[PDB]
Design an enzyme around this catalytic site. Structure first.
Site, PDB file in Angstrom:
ATOM      1  N   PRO A 164     -61.006 -46.706  34.174  1.00 57.45           N
ATOM      2  CA  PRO A 164     -61.567 -46.656  35.463  1.00 57.45           C
ATOM      3  C   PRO A 164     -61.399 -45.081  35.702  1.00 57.45           C
ATOM      4  CG  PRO A 164     -58.973 -46.715  35.426  1.00 57.45           C
ATOM      5  CD  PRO A 164     -59.508 -47.016  34.086  1.00 57.45           C
ATOM      6  N   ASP A 165     -62.545 -44.694  36.630  1.00 55.47           N
ATOM      7  CA  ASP A 165     -62.783 -43.193  36.894  1.00 55.47           C
ATOM      8  C   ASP A 165     -61.938 -42.971  38.565  1.00 55.47           C
ATOM      9  OD1 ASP A 165     -64.341 -40.876  38.111  1.00 55.47           O
ATOM     10  OD2 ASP A 165     -65.173 -41.238  35.858  1.00 55.47           O
ATOM     11  N   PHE A 166     -61.388 -41.562  38.118  1.00 58.82           N
ATOM     12  CA  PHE A 166     -60.595 -41.426  39.482  1.00 58.82           C
ATOM     13  C   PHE A 166     -61.705 -40.757  40.545  1.00 58.82           C
ATOM     14  CE2 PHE A 166     -59.787 -37.681  36.704  1.00 58.82           C
ATOM     15  CZ  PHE A 166     -60.036 -36.521  37.557  1.00 58.82           C
ATOM     16  N   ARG A 167     -62.806 -40.465  40.150  1.00 57.73           N
ATOM     17  CA  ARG A 167     -63.800 -40.114  41.152  1.00 57.73           C
ATOM     18  C   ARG A 167     -64.287 -41.524  41.883  1.00 57.73           C
ATOM     19  NH1 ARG A 167     -67.641 -36.993  36.852  1.00 57.73           N
ATOM     20  NH2 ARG A 167     -66.842 -38.983  35.720  1.00 57.73           N
ATOM     21  N   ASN A 224     -64.203 -38.018  25.405  1.00 59.47           N
ATOM     22  CA  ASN A 224     -62.998 -38.963  26.080  1.00 59.47           C
ATOM     23  C   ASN A 224     -61.835 -38.608  25.713  1.00 59.47           C
ATOM     24  OD1 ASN A 224     -65.144 -40.617  27.232  1.00 59.47           O
ATOM     25  ND2 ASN A 224     -64.870 -42.178  25.673  1.00 59.47           N
ATOM     26  N   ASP A 276     -59.475 -41.312  25.722  1.00 66.02           N
ATOM     27  CA  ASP A 276     -58.844 -42.571  25.730  1.00 66.02           C
ATOM     28  C   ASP A 276     -58.340 -43.013  24.431  1.00 66.02           C
ATOM     29  OD1 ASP A 276     -61.811 -43.586  24.602  1.00 66.02           O
ATOM     30  OD2 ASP A 276     -61.892 -43.529  27.055  1.00 66.02           O
ATOM     31  N   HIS A 317     -61.617 -33.031  23.930  1.00 65.85           N
ATOM     32  CA  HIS A 317     -60.664 -32.823  25.207  1.00 65.85           C
ATOM     33  C   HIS A 317     -59.354 -33.319  25.024  1.00 65.85           C
ATOM     34  CE1 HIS A 317     -64.250 -32.301  28.040  1.00 65.85           C
ATOM     35  NE2 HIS A 317     -64.442 -31.454  27.167  1.00 65.85           N
TER      36      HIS A 317
HETATM   37  N1  LIG Z   1     -63.012 -42.808  28.985  1.00 68.24           N
HETATM   38  C1  LIG Z   1     -62.530 -41.633  29.209  1.00 68.24           C
HETATM   39  O1  LIG Z   1     -61.893 -40.903  28.580  1.00 68.24           O
HETATM   40  C2  LIG Z   1     -63.212 -40.795  30.374  1.00 68.24           C
HETATM   41  C3  LIG Z   1     -63.344 -41.439  31.661  1.00 68.24           C
HETATM   42  C4  LIG Z   1     -63.861 -40.789  32.702  1.00 68.24           C
HETATM   43  C5  LIG Z   1     -64.109 -39.535  32.555  1.00 68.24           C
HETATM   44  N2  LIG Z   1     -63.940 -38.727  31.345  1.00 68.24           N
HETATM   45  C6  LIG Z   1     -64.336 -37.424  31.252  1.00 68.24           C
HETATM   46  C7  LIG Z   1     -65.694 -37.295  32.052  1.00 68.24           C
HETATM   47  C8  LIG Z   1     -66.398 -36.293  30.850  1.00 68.24           C
HETATM   48  C9  LIG Z   1     -67.056 -37.465  29.684  1.00 68.24           C
HETATM   49  O2  LIG Z   1     -68.479 -37.551  29.446  1.00 68.24           O
HETATM   50  P1  LIG Z   1     -69.369 -37.226  30.490  1.00 68.24           P
HETATM   51  O3  LIG Z   1     -70.795 -36.587  30.008  1.00 68.24           O
HETATM   52  O4  LIG Z   1     -68.560 -35.715  31.154  1.00 68.24           O
HETATM   53  O5  LIG Z   1     -69.337 -38.170  31.468  1.00 68.24           O
HETATM   54  P2  LIG Z   1     -69.818 -38.734  32.701  1.00 68.24           P
HETATM   55  O6  LIG Z   1     -68.955 -39.747  33.407  1.00 68.24           O
HETATM   56  O7  LIG Z   1     -69.938 -37.296  33.491  1.00 68.24           O
HETATM   57  O8  LIG Z   1     -71.079 -39.262  32.512  1.00 68.24           O
HETATM   58  C10 LIG Z   1     -71.102 -40.709  31.782  1.00 68.24           C
HETATM   59  C11 LIG Z   1     -72.770 -40.711  31.209  1.00 68.24           C
HETATM   60  O9  LIG Z   1     -72.851 -41.961  30.875  1.00 68.24           O
HETATM   61  C12 LIG Z   1     -73.951 -42.659  31.602  1.00 68.24           C
HETATM   62  N3  LIG Z   1     -73.361 -43.705  31.809  1.00 68.24           N
HETATM   63  C13 LIG Z   1     -71.911 -44.288  32.010  1.00 68.24           C
HETATM   64  N4  LIG Z   1     -71.778 -45.303  31.771  1.00 68.24           N
HETATM   65  C14 LIG Z   1     -72.725 -46.051  30.957  1.00 68.24           C
HETATM   66  C15 LIG Z   1     -72.844 -47.261  30.614  1.00 68.24           C
HETATM   67  N5  LIG Z   1     -71.778 -48.035  30.814  1.00 68.24           N
HETATM   68  N6  LIG Z   1     -73.993 -47.348  30.046  1.00 68.24           N
HETATM   69  C16 LIG Z   1     -74.914 -46.805  29.841  1.00 68.24           C
HETATM   70  N7  LIG Z   1     -74.757 -45.371  30.380  1.00 68.24           N
HETATM   71  C17 LIG Z   1     -73.713 -44.946  30.865  1.00 68.24           C
HETATM   72  C18 LIG Z   1     -73.990 -41.994  33.002  1.00 68.24           C
HETATM   73  O10 LIG Z   1     -75.377 -41.842  33.422  1.00 68.24           O
HETATM   74  C19 LIG Z   1     -73.768 -40.589  32.516  1.00 68.24           C
HETATM   75  O11 LIG Z   1     -75.160 -39.924  31.999  1.00 68.24           O
HETATM   76  C20 LIG Z   1     -65.373 -35.566  30.322  1.00 68.24           C
HETATM   77  O12 LIG Z   1     -65.075 -34.835  31.150  1.00 68.24           O
HETATM   78  C21 LIG Z   1     -64.414 -36.775  29.980  1.00 68.24           C
HETATM   79  O13 LIG Z   1     -63.153 -35.900  29.797  1.00 68.24           O
HETATM   80  C22 LIG Z   1     -63.352 -39.368  30.382  1.00 68.24           C
HETATM   81  O1  LIG Z   2     -63.422 -36.573  36.574  1.00 69.62           O
HETATM   82  C1  LIG Z   2     -63.342 -36.427  35.630  1.00 69.62           C
HETATM   83  N1  LIG Z   2     -64.035 -35.466  34.667  1.00 69.62           N
HETATM   84  C2  LIG Z   2     -64.492 -34.586  34.716  1.00 69.62           C
HETATM   85  C3  LIG Z   2     -65.550 -34.331  35.670  1.00 69.62           C
HETATM   86  C4  LIG Z   2     -66.277 -33.075  35.764  1.00 69.62           C
HETATM   87  C5  LIG Z   2     -65.849 -31.948  34.849  1.00 69.62           C
HETATM   88  C6  LIG Z   2     -64.598 -32.082  34.165  1.00 69.62           C
HETATM   89  C7  LIG Z   2     -64.122 -33.311  34.110  1.00 69.62           C
HETATM   90  C8  LIG Z   2     -63.088 -33.230  33.381  1.00 69.62           C
HETATM   91  C9  LIG Z   2     -62.376 -32.076  32.668  1.00 69.62           C
HETATM   92  N2  LIG Z   2     -61.277 -32.333  31.870  1.00 69.62           N
HETATM   93  C10 LIG Z   2     -60.705 -31.822  30.945  1.00 69.62           C
HETATM   94  C11 LIG Z   2     -60.467 -30.251  31.008  1.00 69.62           C
HETATM   95  N3  LIG Z   2     -61.658 -29.721  30.517  1.00 69.62           N
HETATM   96  C12 LIG Z   2     -61.609 -29.633  28.997  1.00 69.62           C
HETATM   97  C13 LIG Z   2     -62.748 -29.084  28.375  1.00 69.62           C
HETATM   98  N4  LIG Z   2     -63.106 -27.623  29.016  1.00 69.62           N
HETATM   99  C14 LIG Z   2     -61.920 -27.338  29.958  1.00 69.62           C
HETATM  100  C15 LIG Z   2     -61.761 -28.230  30.823  1.00 69.62           C
HETATM  101  C16 LIG Z   2     -60.064 -32.630  30.226  1.00 69.62           C
HETATM  102  S1  LIG Z   2     -60.325 -34.119  30.595  1.00 69.62           S
HETATM  103  C17 LIG Z   2     -61.440 -33.616  31.698  1.00 69.62           C
HETATM  104  N5  LIG Z   2     -62.374 -34.192  32.545  1.00 69.62           N
HETATM  105  C18 LIG Z   2     -62.454 -37.482  35.094  1.00 69.62           C
HETATM  106  C19 LIG Z   2     -62.042 -37.129  33.769  1.00 69.62           C
HETATM  107  N6  LIG Z   2     -61.128 -37.719  33.148  1.00 69.62           N
HETATM  108  C20 LIG Z   2     -61.140 -38.842  33.231  1.00 69.62           C
HETATM  109  C21 LIG Z   2     -60.206 -39.538  32.410  1.00 69.62           C
HETATM  110  C22 LIG Z   2     -59.666 -41.103  32.797  1.00 69.62           C
HETATM  111  C23 LIG Z   2     -60.243 -41.354  34.013  1.00 69.62           C
HETATM  112  C24 LIG Z   2     -61.211 -40.917  34.797  1.00 69.62           C
HETATM  113  C25 LIG Z   2     -61.531 -39.572  34.475  1.00 69.62           C
HETATM  114  N7  LIG Z   2     -62.472 -38.843  35.485  1.00 69.62           N
END
Ligand SMILES: NC(=O)c1ccc[n+]([C@@H]2C[C@H](COP(=O)(O)OP(=O)(O)OC[C@H]3O[C@@H](n4cnc5c(N)ncnc54)[C@H](O)[C@@H]3O)[C@@H](O)[C@H]2O)c1
Ligand SMILES: O=C(Nc1ccccc1-c1cn2c(CN3CCNCC3)csc2n1)c1cnc2ccccc2n1
Ligand SMILES: [Zn+2]
Length: 273
Positions: A34-37, A108, A110, A127
């Site tokens: 789950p996303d905290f956004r 990721n 996770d 990360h």
């Molecule tokens: N599972 C995790 O560990 C997790 C979860 C949420 C956020 N994050 C952080 C968010 C970010 C990770 O990559 P990022 O580029 O930023 O992700 P993002 O959440 O910003 O983007 C996800 C991308 O994937 C696309 N997308 C998402 N889900 C699907 C799907 N289910 N099927 C097809 N397309 C999909 C979406 O359009 C977007 O382009 C880092 O900051 C992570 O640390 C990590």
């Molecule tokens: O809002 C989410 N993600 C981000 C969205 C925009 C910009 C940065 C991060 C974002 C930054 N960030 C870092 C720190 N960065 C490391 C790389 N350069 C220095 C800063 C570690 S993990 C992470 N996510 C977000 C992130 N992690 C999740 C995990 C579990 C569930 C929901 C989550 N939602």
């Protein structure tokens, strides 16, 4: 212009053998993460009790020290062994056993890649990981389970020396990437197929790393949409496969042959889960 069929063929023909992979948030959608956004999710509401300057503070230090709990509520929620991986991860792993995975880079946190059975020799968890930690003062490495005990029971762990707050090895803002990321440099030139799934290519240096692979290397994007540089000035050998990341992945899986072998593997692996 290239196509899934095309890329399939190069992997079968054994002319791609050196496959670098970039995953972000979207591979670990189907697994439940789950996303905290996004509202309406244990984690979202849990993190609202804590009042938080802005979403990122959760991964900023100065804040962490002013108050960890927000970060820890998240740690607790993702700590190893509450989220299975899904089919997107288990292909990546199959890709591995077939001798093809040069390296898998992930934004990721996770650790669903490890638990999918990919050896960490192949991963670069850019990360960070939860599988270790570090007293924020008196400096020591701690394995992951060493603190889990507290983490699940909502307490914020300390070093048995400093009594300083032990912090999981998630990279926070202001810090530079894990040392491991030094392969940045060899992997990318050594790659002969780049595979970009579930990432928005938005966070650095992933934006940049896509333009690293050589001029003539194909970039197979599998995503909800076309993003980053594959969007803002693409290469002839790029091939996009927009849509759900799974109906992306299982499509390819067939084009190559492995629908069967994939199912087999998912059986062994979710009999052990
Ligand atoms: N599972 C995790 O560990 C997790 C979860 C949420 C956020 N994050 C952080 C968010 C970010 C990770 O990559 P990022 O580029 O930023 O992700 P993002 O959440 O910003 O983007 C996800 C991308 O994937 C696309 N997308 C998402 N889900 C699907 C799907 N289910 N099927 C097809 N397309 C999909 C979406 O359009 C977007 O382009 C880092 O900051 C992570 O640390 C990590
Ligand atoms: O809002 C989410 N993600 C981000 C969205 C925009 C910009 C940065 C991060 C974002 C930054 N960030 C870092 C720190 N960065 C490391 C790389 N350069 C220095 C800063 C570690 S993990 C992470 N996510 C977000 C992130 N992690 C999740 C995990 C579990 C569930 C929901 C989550 N939602
Ligand atoms: Zn310590």
């Amino acid at each position: 212009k290239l196509s899934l069929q095309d890329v399939a063929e190069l992997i079968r023909a054994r002319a791609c053998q050196r496959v670098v992979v970039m995953v972000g948030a979207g591979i670990s959608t189907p697994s439940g993460i789950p996303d905290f956004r996004s509202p309406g999710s244990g984690l979202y509401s849990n993190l609202q009790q804590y009042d938080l300057p802005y979403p990122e503070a959760i991964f900023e230090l100065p804040f962490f020290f002013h108050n960890p709990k927000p970060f820890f509520t998240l740690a607790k929620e993702l700590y190893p062994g509450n989220y299975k991986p899904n089919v997107t991860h288990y292909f990546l792993r199959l890709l591995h056993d077939k001798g093809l995975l040069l390296r898998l880079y992930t934004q990721n946190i996770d650790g669903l890649e490890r638990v999918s059975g990919i050896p960490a020799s192949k991963l670069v968890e850019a990360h960070g990981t939860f599988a270790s930690a570090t007293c924020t003062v008196c400096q020591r490495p701690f394995p992951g389970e060493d603190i889990r005990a507290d983490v699940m029971a909502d307490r914020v762990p300390r070093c048995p020396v400093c009594t300083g707050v032990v912090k999981p090895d998630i990279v926070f803002f202001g810090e530079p990437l894990p040392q491991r990321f030094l392969l940045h440099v060899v992997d990318f030139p050594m790659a002969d197929l780049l595979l970009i799934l579930g990432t928005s290519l938005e966070v650095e240096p992933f934006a940049s790393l896509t333009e690293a692979v050589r001029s003539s290397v194909p970039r197979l994007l599998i995503n909800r949409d076309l993003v980053g540089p594959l969007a803002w000035h693409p290469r002839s050998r790029d091939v996009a496969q927009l849509g759900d990341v799974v109906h992306g992945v299982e499509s390819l899986v067939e084009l190559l042959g492995w629908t069967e072998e994939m199912r087999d593997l998912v059986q062994r692996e979710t009999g052990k889960l």
